[PDB]
Amino acid sequence: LGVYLTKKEQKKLRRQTRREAQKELQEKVRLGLMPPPEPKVRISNLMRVLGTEAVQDPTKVEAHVRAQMAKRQKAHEEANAARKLTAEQRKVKKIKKLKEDISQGVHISVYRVRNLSNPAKKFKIEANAGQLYLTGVVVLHKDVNVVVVEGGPKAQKKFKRLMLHRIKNKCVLVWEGTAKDRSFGEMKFKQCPTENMAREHFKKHGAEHYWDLALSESVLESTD
Amino acid sequence: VEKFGDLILKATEPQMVLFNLYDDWLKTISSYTAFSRLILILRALHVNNDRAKVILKPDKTTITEPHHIWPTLTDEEWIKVEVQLKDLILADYGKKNNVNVASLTQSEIRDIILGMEISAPSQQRQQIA
Amino acid sequence: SFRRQRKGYEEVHVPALKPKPFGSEEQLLPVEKLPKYAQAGFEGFKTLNRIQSKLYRAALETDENLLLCA
């Protein structure tokens, strides 16, 4: 397993690396492979470094010191810009495409909403399922919205927080568990006014127990 | 400067006026560089006042707008005018001291631009050595 | 070669430039093509140089003002 290190060791390692680099540069200067470093001159530093020569021709001195400052600034900028292009690259493919490591276990959360007649909530649920790459299905019936979402654990935890807090007639998770493999395809909706058609659609993938649990929860809500 | 002597000679009553000796140079150079350039320009003006005026405008394109005093020039044109004025000052100092321009050193040139002089009517204090 | 500051001084070394190759109508002309007035001046030299052969007719056969930028 990977092992961390204390802040003291972090500071010592950084200090040792920096001292190593500085000694390397200094001994490179010693052997003539590197020109001796030039003083770092800014506007305030101008009259201190080039005071005896700025009176000769001040505008040329200003140009030289501004050129040095711009050289340092532009040296800093190139690497940053290149690695920010690296950001775009990964974000679209290596910094946002994780899939939550869903290979050996698929977390399946099946919830039963009472009122889901608004198409905006269904569109937001489809966008959240497509953005988080979570599979599942949605079945509509008379005061019944059975939304099953199978995916990773982080995607299921995001979808439960989106459906329970970010979406508003009540929504409750009827069955939150784990499965061996995937049972539902892409995130699509199916309108079934009869319970037999929804039961056959759930038994086509082997998930008729979720529809039976939703019917039992509706019967328990209508009884008491 | 032609903008000052006439103005004060036709001023019939005492008053007070404001000017901006750094016309617009501060937009591209720090006030330290502006002051150094200004003091060099005034040194040249005090030296000659005739060849200095010629060096102020290198071409007829450079036009002094009435809003300010010194002519507006490009940055490289300013560099060239500054070096020409430095050559003017050094040559005129050599004219009055029989010393070559190359004979002067960097610190010596800085001193001359600032206004240092060297004299010794009683050199017999060489008896210290 | 190139240029660099080793220790206290900047050494700039440019390598040996390649000479101009002789064409199909340009070669080192010997002293057998010189006339009788010019053969006495080339005493001890059986052949001539490349610049002397490339401008032989412009300087010996022509009495114009020659400008040899050799």
Swiss-Prot record, chain A:
Q: What is the effect of changing T59M?
A: In RP18; reduces phosphorylation; impairs binding to PRPF4; impairs self-association; affects interaction with the U4/U5/U6 tri-snRNP complex; does not affect global pre-mRNA splicing
Expression sites by tissue: Highly expressed in retina, liver, kidney and blood. Detected at lower levels in heart and brain.
Say which domain of life the source belongs to.
Eukaryota
Region: Mediates interaction with SART3; residue ranges are: 1-115
- Annotated localization: Nucleus; Nucleus speckle
Q: How is it modified after translation?
A: Ubiquitinated. Undergoes 'Lys-63'-linked polyubiquitination by PRPF19 and deubiquitination by USP4. 'Lys-63'-linked ubiquitination increases the affinity for PRPF8 and may regulate the assembly of the U4/U6-U5 tri-snRNP complex.
Involvement in disease: Retinitis pigmentosa 18: A retinal dystrophy belonging to the group of pigmentary retinopathies. Retinitis pigmentosa is characterized by retinal pigment deposits visible on fundus examination and primary loss of rod photoreceptor cells followed by secondary loss of cone photoreceptors. Patients typically have night vision blindness and loss of midperipheral visual field. As their condition progresses, they lose their far peripheral visual field and eventually central vision as well.
Quaternary organization: Component of the precatalytic spliceosome (spliceosome B complex). Component of the U4/U6-U5 tri-snRNP complex, a building block of the precatalytic spliceosome (spliceosome B complex). The U4/U6-U5 tri-snRNP complex is composed of the U4, U6 and U5 snRNAs and at least PRPF3, PRPF4, PRPF6, PRPF8, PRPF31, SNRNP200, TXNL4A, SNRNP40, SNRPB, SNRPD1, SNRPD2, SNRPD3, SNRPE, SNRPF, SNRPG, DDX23, CD2BP2, PPIH, SNU13, EFTUD2, SART1 and USP39, plus LSM2, LSM3, LSM4, LSM5, LSM6, LSM7 and LSM8. Interacts directly with PRPF4.
User: What protein am I looking at?
Assistant: U4/U6 small nuclear ribonucleoprotein Prp3
Organism of origin:
Homo sapiens (Human)
From Swiss-Prot, chain B:
Q: In which tissues is it expressed?
A: Widely expressed.
| Disulfide bonds listed in the record | none
- Enumerate the subcellular locations listed in this protein's record, separating them with semicolons: Nucleus; Nucleus speckle
Q: Where are the transmembrane segments?
A: none
Q: What does this protein do?
A: Plays a role in pre-mRNA splicing as core component of precatalytic, catalytic and postcatalytic spliceosomal complexes, both of the predominant U2-type spliceosome and the minor U12-type spliceosome. Functions as a scaffold that mediates the ordered assembly of spliceosomal proteins and snRNAs. Required for the assembly of the U4/U6-U5 tri-snRNP complex, a building block of the spliceosome. Functions as a scaffold that positions spliceosomal U2, U5 and U6 snRNAs at splice sites on pre-mRNA substrates, so that splicing can occur. Interacts with both the 5' and the 3' splice site.
Q: What is known of its domains?
A: The MPN (JAB/Mov34) domain mediates interaction with TSSC4 and SNRNP200. Has structural similarity with deubiquitinating enzymes, but lacks the residues that would bind the catalytic metal ion. Contains a region with structural similarity to reverse transcriptase, presenting the classical thumb, fingers and palm architecture, but lacks enzyme activity, since the essential metal-binding residues are not conserved.
Disease cited in the entry: Retinitis pigmentosa 13: A retinal dystrophy belonging to the group of pigmentary retinopathies. Retinitis pigmentosa is characterized by retinal pigment deposits visible on fundus examination and primary loss of rod photoreceptor cells followed by secondary loss of cone photoreceptors. Patients typically have night vision blindness and loss of midperipheral visual field. As their condition progresses, they lose their far peripheral visual field and eventually central vision as well.
Protein name as catalogued: Pre-mRNA-processing-splicing factor 8
Task: Give the shown range, full length included.
Answer: 1899 to 2027 of 2335
Curated annotation (Swiss-Prot), chain C:
**How is expression of this protein distributed across tissues?**
Widely expressed.
Protein localization: Nucleus
Subunit comment for this entry? Answer: Component of a core complex containing at least PRPF8, SNRNP200, EFTUD2 and SNRNP40. Component of the U5 snRNP and U4/U6-U5 tri-snRNP complexes, building blocks of the spliceosome. Component of the U4/U6-U5 tri-snRNP complex composed of the U4, U6 and U5 snRNAs and at least PRPF3, PRPF4, PRPF6, PRPF8, PRPF31, SNRNP200, TXNL4A, SNRNP40, DDX23, CD2BP2, PPIH, SNU13, EFTUD2, SART1 and USP39. Component of precatalytic, catalytic and postcatalytic spliceosomal complexes. Component of the minor spliceosome, which splices U12-type introns.
Q: Which disease relates to this protein according to its record? A: Retinitis pigmentosa 33: A retinal dystrophy belonging to the group of pigmentary retinopathies. Retinitis pigmentosa is characterized by retinal pigment deposits visible on fundus examination and primary loss of rod photoreceptor cells followed by secondary loss of cone photoreceptors. Patients typically have night vision blindness and loss of midperipheral visual field. As their condition progresses, they lose their far peripheral visual field and eventually central vision as well.
Task: Describe its function.
Answer: Catalyzes the ATP-dependent unwinding of U4/U6 RNA duplices, an essential step in the assembly of a catalytically active spliceosome. Plays a role in pre-mRNA splicing as a core component of precatalytic, catalytic and postcatalytic spliceosomal complexes. As a component of the minor spliceosome, involved in the splicing of U12-type introns in pre-mRNAs. Involved in spliceosome assembly, activation and disassembly. Mediates changes in the dynamic network of RNA-RNA interactions in the spliceosome.
Family in the record:
Belongs to the helicase family. SKI2 subfamily.
This chain's protein is named U5 small nuclear ribonucleoprotein 200 kDa helicase
